[PDB]
């Protein structure tokens, strides 16, 4: 396999992503440098097979029944359909540039694919019966990184990570309508790597960074150049956009990427790729902070470098480059995919 | 209970990064004038050093926070301290970097040092960043060499905007004639052919295209003047904090090293300071002096749009 | 084990993780080093801390197994402050030899051989530590530089031993408490300048000791003592700083835990200096950081000058009130010199009733655990265990030491004085918003006297503090102003807590509140933001300093950018006034000597002085120390009072301004004149730290005198309940010109001193 963006060959799989079957018996790891997907049994923690897909898979989504795995092949500009029981790819559907993420509708009748190409704005829809790409939903700006579907399945959020932009936004889509209802801007943001929904569907979490671009590059202290943040957006009309710090004064979480939401909405799990660790936060303290604060107070609290300690549950040691995380349906275990270490860290959560 | 690590599933083979060893001095970094022989066994280590935030002071960010992680760019515009304050630089697109030396933006003009401007080696770019950007411990020789190996191993993505047949479209074909028109004269500083994989669309030289940002009293004066005509007409705030790109600046040099036009679709916000918000702005004579970058004044909109489409095809 | 971040393998740490690698590289502890001190006030003078010279003390090595003790310092009259090297085979300490030479820095092998003198200084040296700069791995590094316009070439090699950071004080000086010592941090080249030559390409500039093959450079310029340096996990220097400036912190001051670069380029507060924080006036000393939970653990003494006390802790990652702990923490004795081990154990010096020994600490019981060693005849403290220390990362230095900068372009060392021709070393600083602050509107000088927005702040006054040096003991007396606002901290020089100062200069502020300036380097200084009348709205009470060629940035005026908050994203006009020219180091304007006003006395502009002297595009002003302007009461103010005031103000019409410069005896002490004593008189029900009847030190805008001279309500803080009389009122605004009036304004904003000329001079003053 090839290292991404290069013609240099490597024997290492380089896991870029991870997910789990809705019955929680199987983990599917997308190997970016392996051009395949690794199957792992949850109970035995054993590799049960490796299924070949197209070039550079960065993402995968499982059907509600768990008979199929839709893998995003980024370099191939395509999406592979994998038979989970047969351990074989049965089709390749062609999509827009660089799918970086994919998710299946609650009814399992539709798959949504975010095309992350820098000049590309698209979310391609795919019927599961036809196993084919129906149409494309054009976003408000370029580079959707990932999508997410609400628990009621009538709405689709898409993080737009837009190159050359200080203000990067999130699009709200009406699934039945298939068009953009609203666009909400996260001010002073860059590198949006994920978006998740709360189980009640009243909030979304988005991991990103806050650059200070208008300032001289002088020191590294007090986040003069970059700070690392998680933003909670209230899904109601006119809802708050709350940018919250992930960093201590002398301790920062470099490049937050993947997110896993507790099934009951108790905790938030964040893969920290630069600092090689999983940051676990208390979501009732976070949401409690959001509900009890105005927009002004939250905007002031974004730069509070002692604030995290209020809602911070833990920071757990991981392998190198934990780009993605996922949870078991009972929420008692969190898995983190490590690219450089070529492995998966298994974490016992606070849930008992 | 308290969250903890019970086990680790090893799916692939074990891999460990390069050690700390002995950090280079800044003179030792400047001591590497030219590239070392390419080693493809060091490329992954270089990728790690590229994406790692743990090596930095407090772990604030990494290289990938700027040049992103597919190794392209985020389009973020920064003010670095070796070129002067108030002088802005668009984050460099790092795909296909080895094919067009010298490096950075500013060229040979005004740069006898060949470090900040007209950079002789990629080593003098990244090897400097620990002390001039990250403000952290310097790289060891091995880790630096590995990093440079990773950078040199980056290849162009190619344009998505062309037919699955591999051919061009008729809008792009229409634009190619405008591009290669001897009166327009894009081929002069941007020589290349669309079907040629070895085409760099750059002369790798230093030119004055009229993109030099100066003061209200002229070169080496203060404060800066609005170089964006459309933004000046729009009544945009010069010192505004909400803008994606600066409409003002003070440059220490008037001339710059010409970038490749390959993958120009994926560079957020073109030229050096990121004065040009769209491809169209690199043409329409808004953010640059009249006919100092190509002669486009006689062209009008359909032609310009076709030219943009052809640029998207590179 | 992984601590700050995950490692290469499960249960293993990355080399970037200082705490974790420290855990993995520690090894078993067998032997420990510690100080035994005679039990006496003279033998253990912890009440005089930081100035601590436990005369008669010795350094000993103890085996935790064979229980055998060896005295390594027998050739020394006094020895203390042991710190082990990275390998643990050698250690550095402070002490005075029997042959004499004073208290200096030495180093010796762990077996007791190979003694070497690292410092010959006029003054006293203390608490050395090793900072490995350019030396991570054992061996010889290569020296490389540029040919002056040639290529980069190799010249020679140097053994990599790193550097030594220590705290030291000069001879015959006084701090802001009038103690006969002022301590500051120094960096030391162990190879005689060639380490700095390896890193930079020029040898260290500073004071050279060629006989010892060493060189020292002063990295911290605070007018009070900076002491007990240690290592941060990110590779900086952690230490204790005394912030005494003027009347701040209730006229007491605070001892804060803070960090700085090993060259002193970026000092910033960690905990203890700010209002609302914990410990008040408690002394904070001997701070160290735990490896497991990353806790800053320090000795909190009940008295500010005490070195013994309780033990307290705050999180290093998050140094705020929420993480504050009192470790020990009750019964019933005293603690000192804590030493956290990488394996999470800790060694403390504990006295149950009255006599200290080495004890393991118990975190479960919140007190001293099992005993290590105690002699009854000795006070056993400063435990320094023998183990392997992981080297923290060394940060790039842009200064070669005194007068020497290093360019950001070619990275070539340059002398600003000897070569470039500047009268003195000069740096720059920039504030993006001067109106942006976390401080409320209040009567105290560090607060805002009134609300200010963008455009309300016209300029800034930059002030340099003068060290208090008084060779003649007959012409100087402490407590001469005890009846005035100063109290115990007053003196023959001032009736306030503010010591002698001078004006570095004025700098204009942009309409967005931003400002940038060039000014002197390696000198203590601070600033004040000014309104359209040129009065200080808010004062920064602290001592800032700039290394040569170094710029310093801040988001706001005590906004939190250097304390607890992230930098605010601000697009500032001053940014473009900083460096725009290819041929320059800095294009920013130098501090102007004067201000110019209109008819009314409102701010018009800044005005050049005659101190103006091609590496900068701006007129070079205010770099000549001998020409630096100040405001002296006797030379400047008093003549104005005699001319336009004293005639109408006598004993019958208070305040009494008559009598000229003739001294007045108060409580048997003749220091100041009648006018000075009158204007500096306290007011019933008013905090002296705020001000007196007619004068508020370092706020002119709050002063009743200024209120009357402008005949207006200047601030939101009323000096008293009835300001202007109802009947018999006489307007004072026409009595003085703008020069005289603003001279009074400057005098008050400077701290309203009496003698602003350091040392004995010809002008009237205390004599016996
Ligand atoms: C020289 C410029 C001065 C200074 C510095 C002061 N005075 Fe006067 N003064 C005069 C009278 C009749 C009064 C009382 C009536 C009134 O306050 O309007 C004062 C009062 C003051 C004060 C206030 C003191 C207090 O309220 O406690 C101050 C601070 C003050 N003065 C200072 C009369 C004269 C006078 C004509 C006889 C002249 C000349 C001055 N004053 C000059 C000065
Ligand atoms: C020599 C005078 C040139 C001519 C003729 C053309 N280009 Fe050029 N190009 C040149 C320079 C010196 C620069 C960089 C200037 C700066 O301030 O950075 C460029 C840049 C571009 C770009 C953007 C590249 C990037 O931002 O990475 C584009 C898209 C571009 N040029 C296209 C272009 C076209 C369409 C031309 C014909 C009208 C043309 N160039 C001519 C040098 C010169
Ligand atoms: C307005 C006056 C300013 C400006 C322009 C700056 N600072 Fe800060 N400063 C200021 C106040 C009110 C105080 C506290 C005074 C008191 O009595 O408590 C301080 C103090 C500091 C300190 C000490 C540590 C602390 O209190 O946090 C440091 C260190 C410090 N100031 C540094 C600093 C820097 C880097 C600035 C950028 C140029 C700066 N000051 C500007 C008020 C003001
Ligand atoms: C390794 C490594 C690289 N980057 Fe850097 N980068 C940033 C800017 C603003 C610029 C342009 C500077 C100028 O024009 O004067 C660059 C440039 C580069 C280049 C040059 C590419 C070329 O084709 O010339 C390379 C190879 C490069 N950079 C590599 C901005 C940033 C960052 C934001 C502050 C950071 C974090 C960053 N770069 C980091 C890194 C690297 C890690 C050491
Ligand atoms: Ca593609
Ligand atoms: Ca710059
Ligand atoms: Ca080039
Ligand atoms: Ca760009
Ligand atoms: Ca004892
Ligand atoms: Ca004097
Ligand atoms: Cl601030
Ligand atoms: Mg620094
Ligand atoms: Zn403070």
The DSSP code sequence of A82-150 is EETTTTEEEEEEE-SS-EEEEEE-TTSSEEEEEE--TT--EEEEEETTTTEEEEEE--SSS-EEEEEE-
Pairing outcome for strands A226-234 and C283-289: unpaired
CA dist A173 and A182 (Å) reads 7
d(CA C258, CA C319): 10
C169: Cβ below 6 Å to ligand 3? no
Phi, psi for C325 (deg, rounded to 5)? -135, 145
Residue C249 falls in which region: left (phi positive, over 0), alpha (psi -120 to 50) or beta = left
Across the B/C interface, how many CB contacts are shorter than 8 Å?
127
A306 touches chain C (CB under 8 A): yes
- Integer angstrom CA distances of residue A222 from A278, B48, C59, C562: 22, 25, 40, 7
Q: What angle do CA C246, C710, C486 make, to 5 degrees?
A: 20
Given a contact cutoff of 8 angstroms between Cβ atoms, the answer to whether C747 and C755 are in contact is: no
For C49-173, list the strands marked E by DSSP.
58-63, 69-71, 76-84, 90-97, 100-109, 116-117, 123-131, 140-146, 152-159, 163-170
Using alpha carbons, select from C315, C500, C522 the residue that is nearest to residue C424: C522
Return phi, psi of residue C204, to 5°: -60, 130
Helix (H) or strand (E) holding C194: helix C194-199
- Check if the beta carbon of residue A275 is closer than 8 Å to that of residue C5: yes
Query: In this structure, how many other beta carbons lie within 10 angstroms of the beta carbon of residue B300?
Result: 9
Report CA torsion sign: A280, A285, A289, A290.
positive
CB atoms within 10 A of CB B217: 10
Closest residue by Cα to residue C167 from C230, C254, C213, C112: C230
The finding on whether C527 has its CB within 6 A of some atom of ligand 3 is yes
Contact between C146 and B52 using a beta-carbon 8 Å cutoff: no
- Return the partners of chain B (3 or more C-beta pairs < 8 Å): A, C
With contacts defined as CB-CB under 8 Å, which chain A residues touch C571?
214
Q: How far is CA C373 from the centre of its chain?
A: 37
Is the CB of residue C505 less than 8 Å from the CB of residue C592?
A: yes
Question: A44 CB near a chain C CB, below 8 Å?
Answer: no
Contacts of C700 (CB under 8 A, 6+ apart): C535, C536, C706, C744, C745, C746, C748, C749
For residues B283 and B297, what is the distance between their CA atoms, to the nearest angstrom? Answer: 9
**Ligand 1 contact, C440 CB (< 6 A):** no
The experimental method is X-ray
Per-residue b or e along A218-243, where b marks 16 or more CB atoms closer than 10 Å to that residue's CB: bbbbbbbbbbbbbbbbbbeeeebbbb
Q: Nearest chain A residue to B9 by CA: give it.
A: A344
Q: How far apart are CA C120 and CA C625, in angstroms?
A: 27
Dihedral over alpha carbons C97, C99, C105, C107 (to 10 degrees): -80
User: CB C136 to CB B241 under 8 A?
Assistant: no
Contact of B265 with chain A, judged by CB distance below 8 Å, is answered with yes
Give the DSSP H/E element, type plus range, for residue B311: helix B301-312
How many residues would you count in chain B? 314
Contacting residues for C689 by C-beta, under 8 A, at least 6 apart: C247, C250, C251, C444, C485, C497
Directed axis angle between helix B170-179 and helix B301-312, to 10°?
100
Structure tokens at A146: 């990932």
For residue C182, the Cα-to-chain-centroid distance in whole angstroms is 10
Interface of A with B in 195-234 (CB under 8 A): 209, 211, 213-221, 223, 225-228
Q: Is the CB of C332 under 6 A from ligand 1?
A: no
Cα separation, C630 vs C743, whole angstroms: 10
Q: How far is the C-alpha of C46 from the C-alpha of C231, rounded, in Å?
A: 23
| Ligand 2 within 6 A of CB of B269 | no
Task: Specify the ligand 4 atom closest to the Cα of B147.
Answer: 1
Asked whether C336 and C299 are in contact (CB, 8 A), the reply is yes
Q: Which helix (H) or strand (E) holds B124?
A: helix B123-126
Where chain C is discontinuous (C–N > 2.5 Å), the residues before each break are 148, 613
The SS3 of residue A231 is strand
Q: What is the dihedral of CA C172, C175, C176, C178, to 10 degrees?
A: -50
Q: Among C633, C631, C733, which Cα is nearest to C677's? A: C633
3-class SS of residue C594: strand
Q: How far apart are CA B225 and CA C215, in angstroms?
A: 48
Q: Record the tokens describing residue B295, joined without a space.
A: 């002669």
**Pair C763, C634: CB distance under 8 Å:** yes
Q: Does A5 touch chain C (CB under 8 A)?
A: no
- Name the DSSP class of C48: G
CA–CA separation, C446 and A178 (whole Å): 58
Residues sharing a CB contact under 8 Å with residue B111, sequence separation 6 or more, in sequence order: B117, B118, B253
* Structure token digits, residue A98: 């660089």
For C481, residues 6+ apart whose C-beta sits below 8 A from its C-beta are C487, C490, C491, C494, C495, C496, C671, C672, C680
d(CA C267, CA C273): 13
Helix (H, G, I), strand (E, B) or coil at B93: coil
Measured from the Cα of B65, ligand 4's closest atom is 36
Tokens, residue C513: 């509140």
Pair C296, C312: CB distance under 8 Å: no
The verdict on B185 touching C (C-beta cutoff 8 Å) is no
Residue C106's CB is within 10 A of a number of other CB atoms, namely 22
- What is the tally of helices (H) and strands (E) in chain B? 8, 5
- Give the chain A residue whose CA is nearest to the CA of B68: A191
Neighbours of C725 (CB within 10 A): 8
Residue with tokens 């001319």: C643
Q: Within its chain, how far is the Cα of A221 from the centroid? A: 28
Question: Which residue in chain C has the smallest CA separation from A224?
Answer: C567
Q: C735 C-alpha to center of ligand 1: Å? A: 10
Contact B214, B221 (CB under 8 A): yes
Distance CA B206, CA B257 (A): 4
C743 ligand 1 Cβ < 6 A: no
Ligand 2 neighbourhood includes B127 CB (under 6 angstroms): no
Closest-CA residue to C241 (of C158, C304, C171, C301): C304
Instruction: Output phi, psi for B282, to 5 deg.
Output: -85, 0
| C557 belongs to an annotated ligand binding site | yes
B77 lines ligand 2 (CB under 6 A): no
Q: Which helix (H) or strand (E) holds C562?
A: none
Nearest to C106 by CA among C120, C89, C96, C92: C92
> What gap in Å lies between CA C766 and CA A188, rounded to an integer?
61
**Residues contacting residue C757 through CB under 8 Å, at least 6 positions apart:** C500, C630, C632, C635, C763
Q: Are C604 and C637 in contact (CB under 8 A)?
A: no
Query: CA-to-CA distance for C397 and C392, rounded, in angstroms?
Result: 15
Please, what is the angle between helix B141-152 and helix B43-51, to 10°? 100
Q: Which residue of B has its CA nearest to A212?
A: B78
Determine the Cα–Cα distance for residues B142 and B49; give it in Å rounded to an integer. 11
CATH code at A157?
A: 2.130.10.10
Interface mutation vs chain C, best among A270, A303, A312, most C CBs within 10 Å: A303
Residue whose C-alpha is closest to residue C527's, from C365, C679, C749 = C749
Q: To the nearest whole angstrom, how far is the Cα of B113 from the nearest Cα of chain C?
A: 7
> Under the phi-then-psi rule, with left for phi > 0, alpha for psi from -120 to 50, and beta for the rest, what region is B274?
left
How far apart (Å, rounded) are the C-alpha atoms in residues C441 and B123?
A: 52
In chain A, the number of structural domains is: 1
Does B78 contact A280 at a Cβ distance shorter than 8 Å?
Answer: no
Contact state of C572 with B21 under an 8 Å Cβ cutoff? no
What DSSP character marks residue C589? P
Q: How many residues does chain A have?
A: 352
Give the residue carrying structure tokens 């494309």: A136
Q: Which atom of ligand 2 is nearest to the CA of B206?
A: 12
Token representation of residue B224: 């800066």
For C310-313, the CB contacts below 8 A with 24+ separation are C310/C334, C310/C335, C311/C335, C311/C338, C311/C348, C312/C279, C312/C284
3-class DSSP state for residue C549? coil
Contacts of B60 in chain A (CB under 8 A): 220, 223, 225-228, 247, 252, 254
Chain center to CA of C390: 29
Ligand nearest to the CA of B314: 2
User: Residue C58's beta-bridge partner residues?
Assistant: C36
Q: Which tokens sit at A274?
A: 């630069």
User: Which residues have a Cβ under 8 Å from the Cβ of A327 and sit 6 or more positions away?
Assistant: A20, A260, A261, A262, A263, A269, A333, A334, A335, A349
As a whole number of angstroms, the distance between CA A33 and CA C229 comes to 48
Cβ atoms of A182 and A158 within 8 Å: the answer is no
Q: Is B27 helix (H, G, I), strand (E, B) or coil?
A: helix
Q: Distance (Å, rounded) from C-alpha A40 to C-alpha A44?
A: 8
Element (H, E) at C286: strand C283-289
Cα–Cα dist C407/C531, whole Å: 36
Contact of B277 with chain A, judged by CB distance below 8 Å, is answered with yes
**For residue A54, what are the CA distances in angstroms to A12, A37, A122, A253, B222?**
16, 10, 21, 33, 55
Residue C667, beta-bridge partner list = none
Sequence-separated (6 or more) residues with CB below 8 Å from residue C626: none
Q: Of C193, C208, C182, which Cα lies nearest the Cα of C158?
A: C193
Cα gap A15→A245, rounded to integer Å: 28
Cis? peptide before C655, omega within 30° of 0? yes
Which 226-255 residues of chain A touch chain C by CB within 8 A? 227, 245, 247-251
The DSSP bridge partners found for residue A79 are A72, A93
The continuous run of DSSP H or E covering B62 comes out as: none
Q: CB of C267 closer than 6 A to ligand 3?
A: yes
Q: Round to whole Å and give the CA distance between C391 and C413.
A: 26
Work out which ligand 3 atom sits closest to the CA atom of C267: 29
Residue A195 carries which DSSP code?
E
- What does the alpha-carbon distance between residue C193 and residue C204 come to, in Å, rounded to a whole number? 5
The resolution in Å comes to 2.7
Tokens standing for residue C450: 């009134």
User: How many CA within 13 A on the CB side of residue A114?
Assistant: 32
Could you tell me the distance, in angstroms and rounded to a whole number, from the CA of residue B275 to the centre of ligand 8? 9
Q: Which residues contact C474 (CB under 8 A, 6 or more apart)?
A: C767, C768
Contact A125, A111 (CB under 8 A): yes
CA distances from A110 to A63, A144, A153, C343, C442 (A): 9, 18, 11, 55, 63
Q: C131 by DSSP, 3-state: which?
A: strand
CA distance A145 to A259: 13
A9-22 burial by CB neighbour count: b if 16+ within 10 A, else e?
A: ebebbbbbbbbbbe
Rounded Cα gap, residues C568 and C559, in angstroms: 9
Identify all chain B residues contacting A119, using CB atoms and an 8 Å cutoff: 160-161, 265-266, 312
Query: How many Cα neighbours within 13 Å face the side chain of C491?
Result: 26
> How close B133 comes to chain A (CA, Å)?
6
Q: How far apart are CA B123 and CA B29, in angstroms?
A: 7
Structural tokens at position A166: 């200080």
Strands A179-186 and A256-261, sheet pairing? unpaired
Q: Is residue C567 within a helix (H) or strand (E), and if so which, with residue range?
A: none
Is A296 an 8 Å CB contact of chain B?
no
Closest CA to C549 of C395, C430, C407, C420: C407
CA distance C181 to C165: 19
Question: How close B130 gets to chain C, by Cα (Å)?
Answer: 8
Let me know if B114 is exposed, middle or buried by CB neighbors in 10 A (0-12, 13-18, 19+).
middle
Chain B residues in contact with A217 (beta carbon < 8 A): 78-81, 133
| Residue B95 in contact with partner chain A when CB distance is under 8 A | yes
Interacting residues of B127 by C-beta distance below 8 A, sequence separation 6+: B24, B29, B32, B138, B139, B144
Buried b / exposed e over C587-614, threshold 16 CB at 10 Å, is bbbbbbbebebeeebebeebeebebeee
Q: Which residues contact A316 (CB under 8 A, 6 or more apart)?
A: A277, A278, A279, A280, A345, A347, B3, B4, B5
Q: How would you classify residue C24: left for phi > 0, otherwise alpha for psi between -120 and 50, otherwise beta? A: alpha
Q: Which domain holds residue A51?
A: 1-352
Torsion C620-C625-C626-C631 (CA) sign: positive
Torsional sign, CA C696, C702, C704, C706 = positive
- The reply to whether B77 touches chain C by the CB within 8 Å rule is no
Question: B5–C10: do the CB atoms touch at under 8 Å?
Answer: yes
Contacts of C579 in chain B (CB under 8 A): 84-86
C499: buried, middle or exposed (CB in 10 Å: 19+, 13-18, 0-12)? Answer: buried
């Amino acid at each position: 396999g090839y290292i991404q963006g290069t013609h240099v060959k490597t024997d290492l799989p380089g896991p870029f992503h991870i997910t789990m079957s809705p019955d929680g018996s199987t983990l599917f790891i997308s190997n970016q440098s392996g051009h395949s997907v690794t199957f792992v049994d949850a109970r035995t923690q054993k590799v049960t097979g490796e299924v070949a897909v197209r070039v550079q898979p960065e993402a995968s989504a499982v059907t509600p029944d768990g008979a199929f795995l839709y893998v995003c092949n980024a370099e191939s500009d395509s999406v592979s359909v994998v038979d989970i029981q047969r351990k074989q790819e049965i089709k390749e559907i062609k999509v827009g540039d660089w799918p970086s993420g994919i998710k299946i509708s609650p009814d399992g009748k539709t798959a949504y694919v975010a095309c992350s190409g820098c000049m590309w704005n698209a979310i391609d829809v795919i019927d599961t019966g036809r196993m084919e790409k129906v149409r494309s939903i054009y976003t408000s700006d370029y580079g959707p990184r990932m999508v997410e579907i609400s628990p009621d399945g009538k709405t689709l959020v898409a993080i737009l990570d837009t190159v050359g932009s200080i203000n990067r936004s999130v699009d709200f889509i009406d699934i039945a309508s298939g068009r953009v209802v609203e666009n909400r801007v996260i001010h002073e943001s860059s590198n949006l790597r994920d978006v998740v929904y709360t189980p009640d569907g009243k909030y979304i979490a988005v991991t990103h960074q806050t650059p200070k671009n208008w300032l001289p590059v002088c020191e590294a202290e007090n986040g003069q150049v970059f700070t690392n943040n998680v933003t909670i957006i209230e899904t109601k009309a006119g809802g708050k956009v709350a940018r919250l710090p992930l960093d201590d004064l002398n301790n920062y979480d470099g490049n937050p990427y993947g997110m896993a939401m507790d099934p009951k909405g108790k905790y938030l799990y964040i893969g920290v790729r630069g600092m090689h660790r999983v940051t676990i936060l208390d979501m009732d303290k976070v949401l409690g902070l959001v509900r009890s604060s105005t927009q002004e107070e939250l905007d002031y609290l974004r730069d509070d470098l002692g604030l995290v300690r209020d809602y911070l549950v833990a920071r757990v040691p991981t392998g190198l480059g934990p780009s993605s995380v996922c949870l078991s349906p009972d929420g008692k275990f969190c898995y983190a995919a490590n690219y450089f270490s070529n492995n998966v860290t298994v974490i016992r959560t606070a849930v008992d | 209970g308290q969250p903890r690590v019970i086990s680790t599933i090893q799916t692939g083979a074990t891999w460990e990064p390069l050690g700390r060893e002995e950090p280079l001095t800044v003179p030792e970094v400047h001591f590497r004038v030219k590239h070392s022989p390419f080693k493809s066994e060091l490329v992954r280590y270089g990728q790690f050093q590229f994406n790692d935030a743990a090596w930095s002071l407090q772990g604030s960010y990494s290289c990938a926070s700027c040049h992103y992680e597919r190794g392209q760019t985020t389009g973020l515009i920064w003010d670095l301290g070796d070129e002067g304050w108030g002088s802005w630089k668009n984050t460099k697109y790092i795909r296909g970097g080895r094919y067009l030396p010298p490096f950075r933006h500013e060229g040979f003009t005004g740069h006898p040092d060949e470090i900040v401007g007209a950079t002789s080696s990629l080593d003098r770019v990244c090897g400097r960043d620990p002390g001039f950007v990250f403000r952290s411990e310097n790289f060891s020789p091995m880790r630096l060499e590995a990093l440079i190996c990773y950078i040199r191993a980056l290849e162009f993505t190619g344009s998505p905007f062309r037919n699955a047949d591999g051919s061009l479209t008729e809008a792009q074909k229409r634009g190619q004639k405008i591009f290669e028109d001897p009166k327009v004269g894009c081929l002069e500083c941007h020589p290349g052919d669309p079907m040629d994989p070895r085409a760099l669309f750059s002369d790798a030289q230093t030119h004055d295209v009229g993109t030099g940002r100066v003061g209200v009293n002229g070169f080496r004066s203060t404060p800066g003047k609005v170089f964006n005509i459309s933004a000046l007409e729009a009544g945009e705030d010069p010192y505004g904090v909400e803008s994606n790109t600066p409409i003002i600046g003070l440059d220490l040099v008037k001339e710059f090293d010409t970038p490749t036009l390959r993958d120009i679709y994926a560079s957020g916000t073109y030229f050096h300071d990121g004065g040009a918000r769209t491809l169209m702005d690199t043409i329409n004579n808004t953010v640059n002096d009249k006919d100092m970058h190509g002669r486009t004044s006689h062209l009008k909109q359909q032609e310009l749009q076709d030219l943009v489409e052809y640029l998207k095809a590179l | 084990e992984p601590v700050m971040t995950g490692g290469p393998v499960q249960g293993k740490a990355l080399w970037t993780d200082y705490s974790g690698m420290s855990k993995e590289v520690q090894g078993p502890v067998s032997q420990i080093l510690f100080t035994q001190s005679p039990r006496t006030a003279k033998g253990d003078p912890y009440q005089n801390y930081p100035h601590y010279i436990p005369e008669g003390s010795r350094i000993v090595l103890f085996d935790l197994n064979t229980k055998e003790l060896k005295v390594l310092t027998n050739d020394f009259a006094t020895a203390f402050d042991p710190c082990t090297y990275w390998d643990g085979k050698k250690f550095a300490f402070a002490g005075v030899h029997k042959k004499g030479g004073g208290c200096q820095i030495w180093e010796m092998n762990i077996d007791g051989s190979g003694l070497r003198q690292m410092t010959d200084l006029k003054g006293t040296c203390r608490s050395p530590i090793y900072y490995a700069a350019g030396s991570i791995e054992e061996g010889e590094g290569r020296i490389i530089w540029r040919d002056r316009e040639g290529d980069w070439k190799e010249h020679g090699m140097v053994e990599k031993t790193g550097m030594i950071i220590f705290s030291g004080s000069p001879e015959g000086v006084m701090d802001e408490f009038h103690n006969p010592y002022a301590y500051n941090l120094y960096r030391l080249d162990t190879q005689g300048g060639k380490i700095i030559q390896r890193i930079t390409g020029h040898v260290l500039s500073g004071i050279e000791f060629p006989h010892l093959n060493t060189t020292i450079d002063q990295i911290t310029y605070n007018l009070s003592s900076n002491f007990d340096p240690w290592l941060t996990p990110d590779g900086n220097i952690l230490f204790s700083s005394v912030q005494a400036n003027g009347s701040r912190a209730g006229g007491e001051g605070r001892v804060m835990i803070c960090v700085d670069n090993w060259d002193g380029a970026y000092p910033r507060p960690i905990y203890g200096n700010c209002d609302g924080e914990i410990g008040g006036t408690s002394g904070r000393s001997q701070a160290k950081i735990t490896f497991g939970d990353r806790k800053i653990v320090y000795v909190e003494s009940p008295y500010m000058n005490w070195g013994v006390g309780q033990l307290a802790a705050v999180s290093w990652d998050a140094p705020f009130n929420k993480t504050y702990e009192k470790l020990t923490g009750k019964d019933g004795g005293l603690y000192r010199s804590p030493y956290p081990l990488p394996d999470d154990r800790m060694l403390v010096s504990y006295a149950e009733r009255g006599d200290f020994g080495i004890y393991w600490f118990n975190f479960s019981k919140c007190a001293a655990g099992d005993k290590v060693y105690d002699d009854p005849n000795w006070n056993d403290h400063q435990p320094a265990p023998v183990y392997v220390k992981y080297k923290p990362r060394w940060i790039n230095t842009f200064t070669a030491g005194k007068n020497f900068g290093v360019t950001v372009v070619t990275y070539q060392p340059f002398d600003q004085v000897k070569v470039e021709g500047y009268p003195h070393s000069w740096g720059t600083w920039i504030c993006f918003d001067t109106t942006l602050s976390d401080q409320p509107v209040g009567p105290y000088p560090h607060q805002k006297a009134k609300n200010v927005s963008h455009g309300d702040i016209k300029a800034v006054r930059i002030i340099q503090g003068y060290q208090c040096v008084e060779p003649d003991s007959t012409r100087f007396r402490v407590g001469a102003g005890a009846h005035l606002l100063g109290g115990e901290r007053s003196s023959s020089n001032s009736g306030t807590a503010f010591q002698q100062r001078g004006i570095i200069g004025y700098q204009y502020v942009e309409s967005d509140g931003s400002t940038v300036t060039s000014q002197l380097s390696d000198v203590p200084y601070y600033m004040q933001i000014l309104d359209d009348k040129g009065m200080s709205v808010q004062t920064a009470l602290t001592w800032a300093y700039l290394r040569p060629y170094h710029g310093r940035i801040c988001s706001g005026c005590h906004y939190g950018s250097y304390r607890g908050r992230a930098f605010k994203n601000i697009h500032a006009k001053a940014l473009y006034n900083w460096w725009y020219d290819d041929r320059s180091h800095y294009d920013s304007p130098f501090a102007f000597r004067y201000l110019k006003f209109d008819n009314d006395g409102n701010y018009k502009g800044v005005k050049h002085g005659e101190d103006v002297v091609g590496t900068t595009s701006q007129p070079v002003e205010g770099l000549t120390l001998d020409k630096q302007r100040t405001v002296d009461f006797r030379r400047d103010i008093q003549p104005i009072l005699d001319a336009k005031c004293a005639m109408c103000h006598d004993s019958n019409n208070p305040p009494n301004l008559g009598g000229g410069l003739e001294l007045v005896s108060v409580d048997g002490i003749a220091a100041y004149s009648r006018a000075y004593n009158s204007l500096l008189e306290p007011q019933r029900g008013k905090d002296p730290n705020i001000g007196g009847k007619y004068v508020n030190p370092s706020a002119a805008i709050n002063s009743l005198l200024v209120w009357r001279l402008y005949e207006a309500e200047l601030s939101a803080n009323a000096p008293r309940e009835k300001i202007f009389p109802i009947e018999g009122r006489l307007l004072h605004n026409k009595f003085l010109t703008q020069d005289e009036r603003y001279a009074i304004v400057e005098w008050i904003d400077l701290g309203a001193q009496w003698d602003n000329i350091p040392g004995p001079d010809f002008y009237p003053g205390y004599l016996v």
